[PDB]
Amino acid sequence: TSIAIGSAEGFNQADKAINTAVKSGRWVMLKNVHLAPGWLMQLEKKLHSLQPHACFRLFLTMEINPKVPVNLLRAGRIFVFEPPPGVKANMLRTFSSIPVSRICKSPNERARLYFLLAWFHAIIQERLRYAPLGWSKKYEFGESDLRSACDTVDTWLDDTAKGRQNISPDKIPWSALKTLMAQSIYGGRVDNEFDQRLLNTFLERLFTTRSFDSEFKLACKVDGHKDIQMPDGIRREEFVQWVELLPDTQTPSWLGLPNNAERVLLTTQGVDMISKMLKMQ
Amino acid sequence: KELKNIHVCLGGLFVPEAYITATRQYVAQANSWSLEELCLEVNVTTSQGATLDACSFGVTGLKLQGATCNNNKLSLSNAISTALPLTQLRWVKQTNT
Amino acid sequence: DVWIDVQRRWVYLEGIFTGSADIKHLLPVETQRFQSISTEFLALMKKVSKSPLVMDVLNIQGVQRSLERLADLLGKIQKALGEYLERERSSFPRFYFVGDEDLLEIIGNSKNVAKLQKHFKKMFAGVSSIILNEDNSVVLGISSREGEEVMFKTPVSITEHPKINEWLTLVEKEMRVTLAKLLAESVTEVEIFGKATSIDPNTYITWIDKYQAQLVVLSAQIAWSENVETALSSMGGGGDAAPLHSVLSNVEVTLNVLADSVLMEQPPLRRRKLEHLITELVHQRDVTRSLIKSKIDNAKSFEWLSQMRFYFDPKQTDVLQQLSIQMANAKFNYGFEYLGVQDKLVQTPLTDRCYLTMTQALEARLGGSPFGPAGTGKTESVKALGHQLGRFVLVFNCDETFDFQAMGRIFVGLCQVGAWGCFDEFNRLEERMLSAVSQQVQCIQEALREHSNPNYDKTSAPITCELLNKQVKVSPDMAIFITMNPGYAGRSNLPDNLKKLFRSLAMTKPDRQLIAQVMLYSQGFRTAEVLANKIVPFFKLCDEQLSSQSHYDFGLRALKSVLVSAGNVKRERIQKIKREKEERGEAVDEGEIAENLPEQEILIQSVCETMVPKLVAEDIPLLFSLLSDVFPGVQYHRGEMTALREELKKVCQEMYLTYGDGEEVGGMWVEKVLQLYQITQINHGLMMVGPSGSGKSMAWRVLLKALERLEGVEGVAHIIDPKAISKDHLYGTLDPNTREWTDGLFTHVLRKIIDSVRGELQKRQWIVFDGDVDPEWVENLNSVLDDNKLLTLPNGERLSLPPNVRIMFEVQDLKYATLATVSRCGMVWFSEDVLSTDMIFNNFLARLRSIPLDESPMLQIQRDAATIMQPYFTSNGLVTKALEHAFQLEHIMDLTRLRCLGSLFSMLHQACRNVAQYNANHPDFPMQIEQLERYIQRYLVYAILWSLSGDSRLKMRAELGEYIRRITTVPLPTAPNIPIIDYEVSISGEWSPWQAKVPQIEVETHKVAAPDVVVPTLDTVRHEALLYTWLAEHKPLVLCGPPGSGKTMTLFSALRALPDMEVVGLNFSSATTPELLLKTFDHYCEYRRTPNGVVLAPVQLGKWLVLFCDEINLPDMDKYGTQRVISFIRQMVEHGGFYRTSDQTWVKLERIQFVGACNPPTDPGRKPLSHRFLRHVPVVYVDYPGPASLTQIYGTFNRAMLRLIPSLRTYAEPLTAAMVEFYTMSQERFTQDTQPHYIYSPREMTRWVRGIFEALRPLETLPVEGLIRIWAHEALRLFQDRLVEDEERRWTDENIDTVALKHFPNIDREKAMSRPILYSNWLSKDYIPVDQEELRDYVKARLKVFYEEELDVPLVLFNEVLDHVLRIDRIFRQPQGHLLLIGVSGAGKTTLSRFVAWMNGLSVYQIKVHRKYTGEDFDEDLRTVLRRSGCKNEKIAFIMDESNVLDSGFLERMNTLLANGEVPGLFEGDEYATLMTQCKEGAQKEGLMLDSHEELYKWFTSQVIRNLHVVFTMNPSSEGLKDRAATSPALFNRCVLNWFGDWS
C-alpha cells in the first residue's frame, strides 16, 4: 500500500494501512514524509512500541533535508539514492533495472540498441557533475527519461520489425529514435540552444548504422591515444560482461569533455575529505 | 567621435548587451542602413597591432574556454582559458549565404 | 444542540423542495416523506409559538423524542438526496461541472428551458445556447457565443424524452453526430477544391460560409494530409518525378485566394474563418516545402510521421470514430466537441515540438508539463492541441487553496466527462498538496494504462479509479496538463514522484518572427515578411537597450498586443479612407486602398499606442531612435482626440484640476490620460505605475467621467485595497467541512456584475486594485488577465470576464510582482514630473476659492486669502523654492512633496478659519484687507516652516528658517539670533514670540509629576498649537520621536483644548492586524444603513473619535514589504471608508479620525512607513527635552515637591541639577546598542520626582542628608535595576556618588550614602529607610508565616533576596504597576513574587497551561482575572512566565491589557452583557450609580488598572529580549524591568 504524505486524509490512510499491515504482514510505503516533520515523530513512537508481523515492512521515501527527526533516522536503516559514481556504475545500474526478458526479444539488434541507450544515459548523467561545462544547468536527466527512451525504442523497433529475428542496421528507424530523444524524451528538459546542440551532437554520434560496425568507437582519445571500443556482441549478457571489464580509470575525456574539467573538483573534494577527517577527530 | 575608438571591457560594463546594441546602432546610422539587417563578425588581433575601421569596435577581457585563437582560427587546447588580446566586432550587411 | 441543526436542515430542504416544484416527479417517496416532515414542522410551529417561554415548552413531554426522530429523518432524507444527485451525475457526466444548487436548479426547471440557457457555457466547450422552436419542445440545434450555430440533423424532442438527463444526453450525442456529418460533407467539397489547378474564389467563399470555423480548418487539414499521403504513396518507387510539387502548388494557389479574400471587407465570422485557414495553409506550405527539400519519397519516413496527419475513413459505420489524428506513433480519435470560434495559434517549430511531446505523453497515458518563462505559449499551446483533437479543455488557475479535496473533485469531473484539465500555475500549490495530488494523478494514469490494454473489452466491467474514497469511471479521453513558470516567486517545488508522472517540455524561446509574419499575413498586410523581420528584432533590441524596469515587458504578449492593435488600426484606417472617398467623389477600389497603404506607419502607430505609455523618461528617446533606425524614413504623429479632449476639459474644470495641451501646464498629465484611454481600448487588464502622488487616481477618475459624458455609458468604479484584507476575504473561502463556498470581495463584485440584475452589463465597470501587488494574491487573476478572461475558483466554479469590465491596478511600484503579472497587463507609467507642483497649487487655490470650509462670508474670506497667497504659489515662487530646499534637509521620515503640501494646505485652511473666528468675535469691526494680508503672509511663512521641517530636528528647522529669510520678502521677526520657528502669528497680523505663551507656573504640591500635568515649554506650546491646527481639520497626523519624548503627553494636552473629541488608545505591535481596529470600531462605534450606504459612526453623537495608535510602525511587513494595518488605515483615510467582509459592503467612516505615534524608523523593530500612507499624514518630530527645558520642567516639579518641607526649600535648584546631570550621563553611558532595554527618557525623571514625592509626603521634616539618600535610592531603583553587567552597576553607584557630591558639597557622605541603601514601609507606617538586619529578621518571620499559610518551600535569605522583595513591594504599591523579572530559571522570581503579593494582600493568579491550551483558554482566563479585579475590586497579581506563551495572540492580548487596562474585543456577546451586569453590581457596591454602558466600562477599566498587577518572568536571552521588544512593546515601556540574572 503506497500513500503520499501531505494531507489529513493521507495521515489517516497511513495510520490505517500500518495498523492493518502490522497484523496481516503486508508492506506499507509512505512517500514524501519529509513534508510532515512533526508527524514523523509520532510515527517513530508508534513504531517503537510495536511487534508487527514477520513479513511486515515499512518504507519511508524522503528527500535529504534537516527537518527529518534525528530519532526517526536512528530508528531505521538509511539508504541514500543519488547518481551513480561513474559511467560503469551507471550502466550497470541501468542494465540491472531493465528486465532481462525485455532486452532479449524477437530482434537481436534490440540488445545493442539498449546498450547504446545505456551508454548515452550514462554519458549525459555523468556530464551533469561538471555543471558549467558538461551542460549549462543542472538538468534533471533521470530514470524516467531512461524508461521513456526504452519504451520508444521498443515501440519503434517492434513497428519496424514485425517479429523478424534479425533486421539490417540500416533498416532500424534511427531518425525516429534520434528525433524523439532530442525533442521529447531528453530534449524536453533542455531549455538552451547550445545544450540542445550538445544533445543533438551525442544522439547523432551514437545512434546510427555505424554503431553496428566492429570498428565503432564509443569515445575517442580518452587518455593518450587509446579509445573506448564498441563491443562486438549481440546478446545482453555479452554487453553486461563488457561493462564489467571497464578499466575503472574514468576521466572526463570519456564524456567528451577535456581531462582538466575535474582538476578543480577533484581538488576541492580532496580538501573537503581532509576537513571531514579533521571534523571527526 | 572619440568614444568610438576606445576599447571597453564587456565584463566591466553594467549592461554589455546595451553596448552591443549601441555599436550596432552607430554602424547602422553611419551607413544609413536598416538596423535589423546587420550581423556581427569577430576578428581577434593584438591590442597594439590593430586598426578599427568605420564598423569595427574594440573589446578587451574576453576569455576563450578550452580553445586557443591563432590567426583568427580556433584550435582545441588543454588550458582552462586563453586570454584574447583584442576582439574587433564589425557590423556588416546580412548576406543570407 | 439538536434544535438548531434540525431547524437549519428543514429550512434549506424546504427551500430546495419549494424552489423546485418539479422535483417531486423524480423524487416521489422522499417527497411524501418530506410532506410528512413539513406537517410535523407545522405542528411544532403551531404548538411552541403559542407559549413563548422556554420553561413552558421544556415541561411538555414528547418533544425531545420527536426532535430526535425528526433529526434522524432529516439526516436520512439528506443522504438520500445526495445519493440521488450522485446517481443523476453518473448519467450525463457533464453535470459534474455544475454545483449542487445549480444541478437542483436544472432538475426542478426541466419544464421551462429558458432558465437552462445559462448553464450550457459551463457544461460545453463552445455551446453557449440551445436553439429551440416556438413550442420550446424540440431542440433544433446549438449556438455559440459568437453566434455561429450548428443545426442538428435530427432534432431532439423534449416531449418524447421528458427526463432532463435523457434529452441532454441526446442533445450532446446529436451535437457530435451532426458535427461528424457536416465534417464529412465539408471534406467531400474540399476534396473537389483540392487536386485542382485553379480555385474559383466565389465557390471557396461559399464553402467557407457554409461550414463552421472548426470544420473548414479540419477539412482543409484532412484534404492536405490525404494529398500528401497519395503523393508519397506514388513516389514510394524511389527516384521518380515528384507530384508533391503539385500539392505544394495547390497550397500556394489556395493561399493566394485566401490572401486576396482578406484584403477586401468581409463579415467578421468569415474573416476569422479566413484567418484560421490562412494560418493552417501557411503551416501546410511550410511542411510541404520541408518534405520537398528533404526529398522524402516514402510515406513511412519519420519526416512525415513526425507531422500531424489526418485520416478520414467514410467506410466506418461510427461517424465519431470516422476521423483519426496521428502524430508519430500516437493516434487519437476526434472528440467532436463543439468549440465555437476559437483563436487559432500559429504552428511554429516550438508549437510542433510541443504537439509532438504532448502527444507522446498522451500515448504513454501520462500527463504533459510545459514549463518556461511567462508568455512562451505554454497554456495556449495546450489548449490549441486540445482543440485540434476536438477535446473539451478546461483551464484551472491554481493556487494554494487548491487542496486535496478540490483537486480530487476536479479530477472526478474530468474522469467522468472525459475532458482535458490544463492546470496553470500548478506550482502555486503547497508542496504537501502537490504530494497528495500525486497519488490521485498516479491512480488516474494507472486506470488509463489499464484501459489502453487490448485485453480489456468495452462490454466488460468499466475501468474505475479510487478518487476521494469512491469508484470513479475514467474516460479514455481524459488528459491532465500542468503549465508552470519555474523560478517565479510564490511557486513551490514539485516532488520527484509527481514529476515522474508528467513528460516535461521546455518552452522558453517562442518563434516570434514566424508568429508575427503569419499574423500580419492573415490580417491582409502586404509585405508581412519585412514587417515581421523589422518588428521582432525591434522588440529584441528594446529588451536589450532599454533600462531594466520592473514594469517593462517586451515578450510575446507585448508583440501579440502590438500585432492585434496593428490589425485594428489597419481596419480603422481603411474605414477612414472609405468614408473620405464616400464624402469626396464616388470611386472606391478596395484593392487600390490596400495597395497604397502605409503598413510600416500602421505598425509604428501600434507600437507607440502600446509600448510608449509604459516607458520612463530616459527610455523614450532610446525607443524612438530604435524606431527611426529599424523603420527609417517613416514617421507617425498621434491623432488629436479632440472629442475626448473637450470632455476632459469640462471634467477637469468641474473637478478643480489643471488641463493642458502639449507643452502647457498639465499637458503631460493629459497625455497620460489619453494613453490610459488607448490602453483601455486595447487591453482588458491595465496597470497605472508610478511614484506616490503622480496623478494616477485623478487620471483614471477623470477618464471615467469624460467617457461617461462622451459615450453616454455610465461608468462605475469598484476600488479595492487587496492587501488591506486577507486573501480569503478577497477571493473567497471553501469550507473544509461542508464544502460551502463563501465569496470574497472581488469575487462578489465580479459575480454581481455578471448577473447584472440592475443592468450592470450595460455600464462601464472598472475594478481598480489600489494597493500593493505581490504574487500571492495577483496571480489568482492570471487566467483573468489572459486570453481565458476567466476566474477559476477551487470549488470548480468559473466566471467569465464580461467585455465591459476592465481590471485595473493603481500601484507605486512593481518590485515584487513577477513577470507573469507584468506581461498580462498594459502599463501606463506616471512619473512625478507628470504632475507638476504648479498643478497642485492650482488645485488647492481652486478648491479654496470654490469650496467653503464651514460646509457666504466664509467663502469670501477664503477667496480673499487665496488672492493674497496667489503670488507665493507660482512657479519659482516662495513655496516652490522652500520645498526644493527642504528636500535637501534631513527628516525623521522620508520626505514626499504631497505630505508637506497637504500639511501646508491644512494649516492655511486653519488660518482662514482663524480669520472667520476673528470676524465672528468682532461683529462691529470685521478684519480689513490690510490686516488680513499681513496675517495671511506671516501665517503662510509659519505654515511653510512647520510643514516642510516639522519632521526634522532643531538644526534643520533653523536652516530652513534661515533659507526662507534669505529668499522671502514677507516681513519677518527682526531678532538677530532667535530663529523664525520660535514665533507665531497673532490674529492681529504681527509676529509674536512663543515665549509669551510659556509662563513660569507653580504646580500644586499634591499634583507633583502627575500623569496629566505638563510644565509649559517652547516645544510644548509650539507642538500643542501645531497639533490643534492639524486636529481641528480632522487631518490624520503622526508624531515621531524617541520613546518617552512626550508625544502622548503633547497629544493629550492638545486634545484637552478640543472638548468635542474623544480619544481611544490602540497599542500596535509586530502582529497587529486590522482586526484590532475592527474590534475598536465594534466597541466604540456603530454601523447604520443610511440611504447612501452603510455608515460607521461613533456611538456618542456630536463627538469625533480619535483613534490614537501608540506604535504605528511596529506591525510586521510581509515578505513583499507591506503592512496590512497600514494599508487598512491608508484606505480609511484616502477613500474615507473600508470594506465589511461579512457581506462585502462598503462602509463609510463618519466622525472618525486617526492619530499615530511612533519611534524613528531607524530604531530596531521599526519599519519605514509607506509613501502612499505618509502622503496623507503630516509628521511632527518631538525630540527629547534639552538640558534647559528639562531643568525648567523638573525644576518646577522639584520646587512643588520641596514645598512640603520648608527647611529643604532651598535645595530645589541643586537637586534638580543632580537629577538632570546623572540622567544625562546614564543616557550617554547606556544606549540601545548594548542592550535593547537600555532606554532612558524624561519618563525616568517623572518617576524619579514622583517617587521622591511619595517618600516625602508623610514626613513632617527631614535633613538634607535624608533627602539625598532618597534621591540616591530612587536613582538606584530607576537606572540600576535594569542593568545586566556588574561593571554597569558599579559605574552607576560610583557616578551617583560623584554627582551627589558635586551638587551637594557640604554634606555628610556616610550618613547619606551608606551603601546598603534600603527603603521599606514594612517595619513602620512610613516609607523610611530600613536596616538590613531588621529587614532580614522581619522577612524571616513573614516567611515562616508564609510557609505555614502558603507555599511551604524553604528559602535562604541573602542580601539580593531582600533587595528583590523590596523592589517587588515597591512595584505592587503603585497603580498599574507591572513587573518584568528577567533572570535564570530557578532563581526564585516566581516564589519571591508570590511571597511579596501575599505580604501585600494580592491574590496570586497563574494560568495553568497544558498541551491542549489554546487562545480561547487564555481569553477565558483573562476574562476571569478581569472580572475578579475590575468587578469584585480584588487586587490580583497575575504571574506569567515566558513558557506559558504558545502563540503571538498571548502577547497581543497581554500588550493591550498592560498598556490600556482593557482588551477591546475580550468581552463580546453574552459575555459583554454579563460583564456589564457585574460591573453595575460592583459600582452599586462601591456607591456609584452608573447607567450607560460607556461610563460603566470606563469604571471597569479604572478598576482593572488600579487592581491588576502583571508580573512577567523570562529567562535572559539575547535575541529573545530583542524579539519581545517588538512583539510586546508595553513589556518595555509599561513594565518595570528588574534584571535578577543568575545568583552572584
Ligand SMILES: Nc1ncnc2c1ncn2[C@@H]1O[C@H](COP(=O)(O)OP(=O)(O)OP(=O)(O)O)[C@@H](O)[C@H]1O
Ligand atoms: N490634473 C490635475 N491638476 C491639478 N491637480 C491635480 C491633477 N491631478 C491630480 N492632482 C492633484 O495632485 C495630487 C495627485 O493625487 P492622486 O491621487 O491623483 O495621485 P496618485 O499618483 O494616484 O497617488 P497615490 O500613488 O498616493 O495613490 C492630488 O492632490 C490631486 O488632487
Ligand SMILES: Nc1ncnc2c1ncn2[C@@H]1O[C@H](COP(=O)(O)OP(=O)(O)O)[C@@H](O)[C@H]1O
Ligand atoms: N504560436 C503562437 N501563435 C499565436 N499566438 C501565440 C502563439 N504562442 C503564443 N501566442 C500568444 O501569446 C500569448 C501566450 O499566452 P500563454 O499561452 O498563456 O503563455 P504562457 O503559458 O507561456 O504563460 C497569448 O496571447 C497567445 O495567444
Ligand SMILES: Nc1ncnc2c1ncn2[C@@H]1O[C@H](COP(=O)(O)OP(=O)(O)O)[C@@H](O)[C@H]1O
Ligand atoms: N513639559 C513637560 N511637563 C511634564 N512632563 C513632561 C514634560 N516634558 C516631558 N515630560 C515627561 O516626558 C514623558 C513623556 O511620556 P509620554 O507622553 O508617554 O511620551 P511618548 O509619547 O514620547 O512615549 C513623561 O514622563 C512626561 O511627564
Ligand SMILES: Nc1ncnc2c1ncn2[C@@H]1O[C@H](COP(=O)(O)OP(=O)(O)O)[C@@H](O)[C@H]1O
Ligand atoms: N532563595 C532561595 N532559597 C532557597 N530555595 C529557593 C530560593 N529561591 C528559589 N528557591 C527554590 O526554587 C524553586 C522555585 O523556583 P521559582 O521561583 O519558580 O523559579 P524562577 O526564578 O524561574 O521563577 C523552589 O524549589 C524553591 O524552594
Ligand SMILES: [Mg+2]
Ligand atoms: Mg499560462
Ligand SMILES: [Mg+2]
Ligand atoms: Mg491614488
